[model samples]
Target: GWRHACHALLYAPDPGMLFGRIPLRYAILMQMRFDGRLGFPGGFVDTQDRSLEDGLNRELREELGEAAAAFRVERTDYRSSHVGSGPRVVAHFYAKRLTLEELLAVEAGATRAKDHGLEVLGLVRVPLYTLRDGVGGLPTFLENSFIGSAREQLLEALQDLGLL
Candidate 1:
């Protein structure tokens, strides 16, 4: 009866330079997990951690390198929680906004993360805007497989933050 996990959403007001200044507007973060489905950068809380946010930060460092802790998520950033398996798999979701520069640092540092080639396969940024192709952006990204309630949590964050 002592199972819990945490996940976080890191986002930014994108300047759109990467896409050649096409006004992408926003950037949301996700991970390509080892299991082949998409998910956020976090994991089960370790017994040694003092709080949920601390545990989430611990997970973040492992997945995104030390630069991740610079923009630590706080209790106040908590978004939603989900319970699963009859009290065996509780999940806590949180989100925090970062500047585009800060978000880029987190992404770049992930290549050197401890779990980079293991638990985490890669880092991905959400395309918050739709393209002229009618389905080349957010809609297309949404079609990818997601793990657990990752997809639901992402959608909720997007809507609540007006990224949609």
Candidate 2:
């Protein structure tokens, strides 16, 4: 049987105004993996879990500490599957929107938690400036190293949300 995993993309819309309209300034939360690769916060789905969402929430709490409770799953989708060298796995991805203040709180909360140095080395923001600056925008964001298919997953989610 294939192993299952889930991850989330937490983002906040930029409050700045441009030409009397809210400009597309959004920040995505990504974690620096123990191996130095960037990825979302999530982990394996245990057999005893009640449901996929439950398992995802559990994993998020483990990976993100108390902030996981504040993260509301706005959208969830079957991202992709891997059948290569490692265990065959299917990944479910979620997009959760949070206010700038809430996002900051989660970051601070996670930092003070004990799990900070374990599976999660550190949390980093994917510069929204690059996304706003067209003509090499998405590719520039994709240049960063990501674990597994996380890079593709993020690209798809951004495009799906019409943010790209």
Candidate 3:
């Protein structure tokens, strides 16, 4: 007896080929959950009514607003899954690549979502690169608390996909 849940890593290509700037490769997104932990936008999914990907998309609409309509977390986007510390729960993690423009729009539109400030506090982008001094960007972000296996999922997605 297990409950189903799904989460995602949203990212986009950013080719800042100009000089004197941090030429980042991708812009990644995570949310500040109301519980004060950082996690992805997904919740419980009842399989009888929806597929895992569809359920995730529905939850995305709730926490991210209509801008979520711009893209879909296809079944193929799935990356991995893990059983939580709690018994009877399996958490699936997915990753979707979007255009930079769409990602920006999603960030702005999230402010108007029904779950905004309730379930989801705010949207945050991952600093994919480190500063010259080191220990400033990703290392610091990793120190923040994450729910369940989310932090593991994020790092797995990063190395598995070579996002960094």
Candidate 4:
């Protein structure tokens, strides 16, 4: 019995200027109605989910706000990160981009955020020059699991998006 998790890599458009800039945000994952280490928006998939994308989108909307019409899925990658146990967890990685305004519109529920060990803190716009540095140090977060293939996929996507 393998379990499945779906996640999204949210991004914002680069402001046109001498140096490109995009707003970066930090997410606090809620587990069992308790605030937890910051992470991306995602959750387990239902057995009847038409696809992981469907599940990811559903979870993202549920955790964040429902105003994601401006967000677009740039790409998707799948990987296996679970070992042994009753169910091996497979994860689907989806890349999504949002505009600065749209990014601002997204919201995380207060109760959910608190439950997830979050303070409902707003986005943490990652500056351009420090993108790599920030990402490199992401592992230091309270309970960061964005390592290995997950980290690789993020770097690749950021590079491809020219945000790196």
Best by TM-score: 3
lDDT digits (tens) for residues 50-160 of candidate 4: 776677766665555545534544334333233323357765666665555555565433234322234333334333343355654333442353322344445556577
**Model 4: which ten-residue window has the lowest total lDDT?**
25-34
Question: Candidate 2: which stretches are off by over 4 Å?
Answer: 16-24, 72-86, 131-141
lDDT of 3 by residue, 43-63 (tens): 789998869988999999999
Residue 1 accuracy (lDDT) in model 2:
81
Cα lDDT for residue 148, candidate 1: 75
Per-residue lDDT value at 37 in model 2: 85
Give the per-residue lDDT of model 1 (tens digit) for 2-116.
7788999998886665458567667889999999999988889975669999999988999999888789899899999987544578789998889889999999999999999
| Cand. 3 TM to true fold | 0.89
All predictions: root-mean-square deviation over Cα? 2.5, 3.9, 2.1, 6.3
Model 4 CA lDDT for position 19: 33
The lDDT leader among the candidates is: 1
How far residue 8's Cα lies from its native spot in candidate 4, in Å, is 1.0
TM-score of 4: 0.56
lDDT score, candidate 2, position 140: 74
Model 2 / residue 144 / CA error / Å: 2.9
What's the CA error at residue 124 for candidate 2, in Å?
Answer: 0.8
Off by over 4 Å in 4: 16-35, 69-87, 107-128, 131-152
